[PDB]
Structures are given as C-alpha cells and as structure tokens.
Specification:
Chain lengths: 246, 355, 302
Amino acid sequence: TSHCRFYENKYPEIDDIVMVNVQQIAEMGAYVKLLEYDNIEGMILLSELSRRSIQKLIRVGKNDVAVVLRVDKEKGYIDLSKRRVSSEDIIKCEEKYQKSKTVHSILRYCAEKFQIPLEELYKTIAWPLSRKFGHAYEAFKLSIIDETVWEGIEPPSKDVLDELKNYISVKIRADVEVSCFSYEGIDAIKDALKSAEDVKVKLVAAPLYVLTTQALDKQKGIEQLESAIEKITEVITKYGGVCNIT
Amino acid sequence: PGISSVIPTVLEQSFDNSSLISVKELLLNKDLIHPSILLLTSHLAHYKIVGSIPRCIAMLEVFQIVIKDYQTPKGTTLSRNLTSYLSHQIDLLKKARPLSVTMGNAIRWLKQEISLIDPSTPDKAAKKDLCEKIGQFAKEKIELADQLIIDNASTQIEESTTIVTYGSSKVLTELLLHNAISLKKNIKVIVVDSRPLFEGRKMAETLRNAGVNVMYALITSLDTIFNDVDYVFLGAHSILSNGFLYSRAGTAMLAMSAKRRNIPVLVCCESLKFSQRVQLDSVTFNELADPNDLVNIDYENPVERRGNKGALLNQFIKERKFEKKKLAMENKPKGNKIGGKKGSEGESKDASNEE
Amino acid sequence: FNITETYLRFLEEDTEMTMPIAAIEALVTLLRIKTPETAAEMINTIKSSTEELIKSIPNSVSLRAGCDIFMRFVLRNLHLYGDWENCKQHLIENGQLFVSRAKKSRNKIAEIGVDFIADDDIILVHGYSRAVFSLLNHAANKFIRFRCVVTESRPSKQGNQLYTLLEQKGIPVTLIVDSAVGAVIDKVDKVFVGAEGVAESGGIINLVGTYSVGVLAHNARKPFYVVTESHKFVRMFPLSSDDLPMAGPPLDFTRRTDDLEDALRGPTIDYTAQEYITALITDLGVLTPSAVSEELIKMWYD
C-alpha cells in the first residue's frame, strides 16, 4: 500500500522541486501521480513542457522532472512545469525520487511483519527525521552509523526495529579450490575464516571451500569477493602453499 | 569476392527491371564478414512469416548486436573501413532480398548517427551511449506508435462486427488478438490466403492459438462469402509521395470487391514508412522471386508430388512469373490509422516534410 | 453561471452571429470569473463543462468543434513564456474579438467568393447555412443574372422557411421533391450545399439527404460544392458508409404496430465521401483538396 506525503507539509509551495511518473499524456497536459510530494495526482500543462518530437519521449512510465508553479492551499489543485527546469535539476529530482522510494521500502517490511497500518508508522517516523534532520533515509543512515535519532521519541515496537536493522545489515556463488602444500595449514585456514566473514561459509569437501557473498545492490558483491580472494592469497604465501581461484 | 551470374528458368519478355536471381548455398567469400548478417540474409531469402513490420526491427537488432561486438582497430579510427563494411552488408542484402523503405530509413538514420559523433571519443563510452540511444529511438517511433494505433482502433470498433482480413502484418494480428482477449466483443474473423507466402494460414493458426471463431477463404472464393459482413482490413508496406498504396500481393482486388459491395476498406500504417520515391505502377520497381514458390500442388508447403508439372528450362517458350509487391488504387481505401490518430490517404507526404 | 443557459438565450432572434461563435463567447464568459491564472483550477473545469454540454446535447455537432478550437487557441496562447497577467488579459479580450471576426469573415466570403454564379447558372441548394444565404443575398445587390432551384428539406418543414427567406429578396423560385431530383440535372448547372461539419477524412457531415445528391452529381459530372464558415473541423472519422456519432437512431426497425405511431425515424443526418468535393469555400483562402486535414494536422501537431 502506497499513500501519505513524504515531507512534513501535505501540499508543496512556490519554486520547490518535484518528480512525476506519467501514466497517460496529450489532452490538456498530464494529470499524473507524484513521487516526491504525496501520491495524490497533480497537473502539468502542454505549454511549458516543450523546450526545444514531443509526443514520443515521455508517454508511459519514464521519469520526468517537474517544478511547482501555483498552489491552491484550500481544496487541492497543483500546477506543475517542465520548461523552467534546468539540466542541473534533472539529476537532483531523480535523486530525491530515489530517496523517497528507499524510504517507502524501509516503511513496508515493518508494516508487513507486525501487521499494523503504514500511515501510523509514517506519522511516528516523520517528525524528528523529516523536520529536524532533513530527509528520512539520511536520518536512518545516521542512526545505523551511531544511534541518536531514534532516541527522541519512544518506540511502540522493538521487534520491527530489530528486523529493519537486520535487513540493513543477494547471494553470489564463489568456489575457492584450496590445494595447500604447507607445513602449518589449519591455523592459516582459521585466520582466513576470521577475516573473510567480518559472508556465509559452508564446507562439503576437504579441499573445496564454498562461500556465498552477500550483495547490497547486486554490483557491490564483486568488490567483496575480490577482497576475500586477496585475503586468501595473502594467507598462504607466508607459510608455503598454494590456493587456486576459478 | 562473392558469386556472379547463373540464373535458373526463363527470363521472360515482360517485366524485366529488378533483380530476381545469387547465393542460396554458400561457396567462397571474403574472410572478414560477421556471420550474423549472413544468417539473416539466409533467413530472409527463405522466409514465410515476415511482412514489412518485423523485418526492420530485426535489422535494427542485428545492427545493435554488431555494435556490441564491434572493436576499434589500434591503427585506424572508428570510421575508416566501417563504412566499407556497411556497404558490403548492403550489397549482400540486396543480392539476397531487395531493401525495403523502412530498411532505407534505418540506413539513413545510421548514417546520420555516424555523422553526429566525429572520430575523437574512446570506444567503451561512445557505443555505450549509442546503443542506448538507438534502443530509445526504437521504443519511441515503433512500439509506442503501434500501441497508439491499437488504442485508436479500439475506440473505432463499434458493436456487432464481421471482418474479412488478409496478410502476415504483425499489427493486424496484434489488433485481432486484442479484440479477442481484452475487448470481449462479438468479433468474427474471416481469413484470405495467398500462393507466394502462407500468411493467411499463419494468421489462422494465431487466431486458433487464442480461441476465435474463424472462417477460412481464398482469393477466388469471394462471390459467395458475402451472402451481414461489414469491415475489411488490410496491411500496408509503404505509402509513396503520390498517395497510392504500395503494399503486398492480394489486397487491391479485395479492396475493389469491397468497394463494389457497398462497404469501404480500412488500412493501417506507421509514421516512418513514408517515401520520397515517386511511382504509380508495379512495373517501376517490384519484389520478384524465383518460380520455385509456384511449384507445390496445393494442400501444404512440404509435400512434393510427381504430378503434371516440374520443368522450366527444358520447356520451349514458357514464362512462369509471379509478383509479390503491388500498387493499389488511391481512392478505394478511405481510412488510414497512423501516428496522428486518423487521416486520409490523400495527405501523402504531410509527415515526410515534418520528419 | 452556465453555458447551457447562455445557449438557450438566442432562439427566435439569431440569424446573424455563427452558432460556434456564440458558444465560444459563452465559454469565454464562463472562464473570466473564476481566475484564468491557475491552470489546475480552470482547464479541468472547462473540460468538465464541455463534457456536461455534450451530455446535454439534443441534436448539435459543431459545439464540440468550437470548444476544441478554443482549447487549442488557449494552448497556443501560453507559449510566449512572458507573464501570466498580460496573456490572461489577451485571452479574455479574444472572446468578443473572435465574435467580431466572424462578421468580417462573412464579409470577405460575400465579396470575394461569390464569382461562381455569373452567367445565369442555375443553382441547386440544400442544407441550410447562413453563409450561403449571405452569398446569395449579397449577389443580388450586384445585379447579376441568376436562378434558384430548391430541394424540399423535411426535418420539421425547414424547406418552407427557406423559401420564405428567398421571398424577401424577391427572386423567382420553384420547389423540387428529393425523389425526382434524379430526373432534373439537365437545366440545373451546379450543386451547392451548406454543411453542419467537415470530417477528418475530408467528407461532409450534413442533413436528411446529401449522399444521394452527391452520387447523382458524380454520375452527371456536374460539380458538387460546399460553402461553410471556417470553424467546422471536428476530430471525427466516419469510417464506413453508414456510421456517425449520432444522437438519433441509425435505421431502427420498429415492431409490428397497428395504429401507425412509429414510422418517422428516417436518417436525418447523412455522410458523403471525400472525392465528391470540387470546391470548398472558406474565409481562410480558397482551399479545398486536402486542406481541412492539413489544418487539423497543424492544430494537433501530429
């Protein structure tokens, strides 16, 4: 379930920047949903959309950068623009959108696990995180590094928090053919084990060591595996043996 | 170097301007050609499925693959022998099966792209951006356009329909499928088949794979099929600067028949198929193939019967010739479904100058 | 404030400003109250109003065309990227201005595009349009030999009304039934027609019987003409011979009655193909062949 505003205020202001994901276009403009300031749909016009083929680029699903023109803070009418947006703002708005998405992801597992409403969770989170700190994702990151943001308001659920922490903390298959011819080997192996995990280590055969590397965002797993390999290489060079890596 | 001369069957007296000959079984070629192009050529030569729409897409895909595989030499720049290679590829294609309007357009686009980026940039950064751009272009001018056309058709179709259809045009298949599945109307599909390519049969098969009420007919059986039946749909190849329908085989006759029996015809086309080349007859430039297609005695493609006929060269004064691409009359089709929703065929080159 | 009420305003009067112009004026009036600065509060509301109008329509086509034209104009307006006030003001001005324009257009038509009837050319007129009548009346002021043939129009006895308007100018006239129309093409030179709307394909959206007339003209090779004020271009495609978005029934086979109650449900709107037109007389230059389509393309940029 996806609802409620990302920031503190429900409706945007003048000059502030937003992100729109277009479902359907070409009639008046686009009355499409926002992924920066609430999931409630706002309207762009077909006048400040063309800057320099126009009906082919946007269409469905593709990320488009917007800026708020006129706000009716009474009932709910939001004016948006694409032409006022510069090339510098493109990345920025996209980044913001990404952050929002991450925040949403963070407040979904919790909703699932404890079987409690998401809106309430959002309310309980977005007050010392979205007002004082800045954005929510950054606050979360800060908390993970050193706990200081969560201490402000008392948590109704601790298990959920623990789960979130665990999540914060994809398996890629790695096989190292260990074929040592050294005097002391067991100790070396132990040392290797003690450095590589600090991930999942399983043993099937005596010369074969099976390890599955945990990845945060798919591409990050290449850096860790390589490091592990390097460590392994370092391990046996001093004693007097060999380790082959496929 | 390739292969030259040696052509099967009689050359005939009339209709001699375009290539109809050539490599069917490969023997001695230049040792630098990427095999994917060759394979494609082999496919196109003996193809029974493709019809104007998918060919260009396939070509684009092939080009993308080539780009992905492309490695810049250490001595010469990115564009030095690349153009030569392209030319060779084109020559091969022509030898196999003559280039279409869409293909020409694609070639032009490629040329433009080549001109855009001058030899100065590194290898892995340039082609990364090129392939993405090309993909984006493909997404824009083709698939999205098709979707738009489909949606236009959706609103245009009323209640209680009985339709006669022809061709292996992918768009039409998509349309019919859409009608069958997501619209849930009272749709009846009647299929017309042709001798050079079993397109109608394929269409019928596709319909069956969905679960539609299908009548199956031919070019000859048309006087009894009407005797309730309203809509007629055709698949276009390209529209010229004149406005005439330059399409496949058995369409024009059908259109004429429709005109005669009250109810007009509707044809679908893309917003890139338009050409600057001027012609008003089939004699100008035509897709002519080997008389091997008109050998099998009915029923199916692979049967091979020793009946009455099976000779071409030994026969004294005998001309067995067939045509694939035709030029239909201008006034007969009324509806044209393009990128700009709806319009008349008399517009001709309104999108050509627009680019 | 209502547009429907405004529309119901003129009824017994009229006979001056084009309908599509009155509607436009009404739209403008509706707009210039609830602040046209904001696009979120306004354009959507306008669209809703238009939808409502469409829903409420008894038997009218050109309203939609007018409204879409207005929308297009509005869209064009905010491309200058200047300021919101001045542009808004300009837009506001452009409603009454548009109305004013219509008269000028009519004048242009009546002075330039009247050269068809000169050497005692007998005219066959069907389908009531104000422009055609203006052309006729203005043609009598130049003292030019001409003759009129009237085909009987039957929606609710409009033919009689038509013949009553030609009597004011004092011009010999005769009545012809649209059954014997095939018999008389000999002495009558050219066929002239007033249209309700012009289609995307090129063809004409008209009244109780026009297609047959067109066919007859084609047979006889005596040219078929359409004279309309240039604002009747609707995004509508009559794909088949007997299909239009009509409010009335499209040939309804009524059940076996006895007291003779259900009978008069005949086609009151008919469509003819694109090839039948020889000349289309409009204020935006003398243009016919595929001009409407071009205009549409220019408007939609597609």
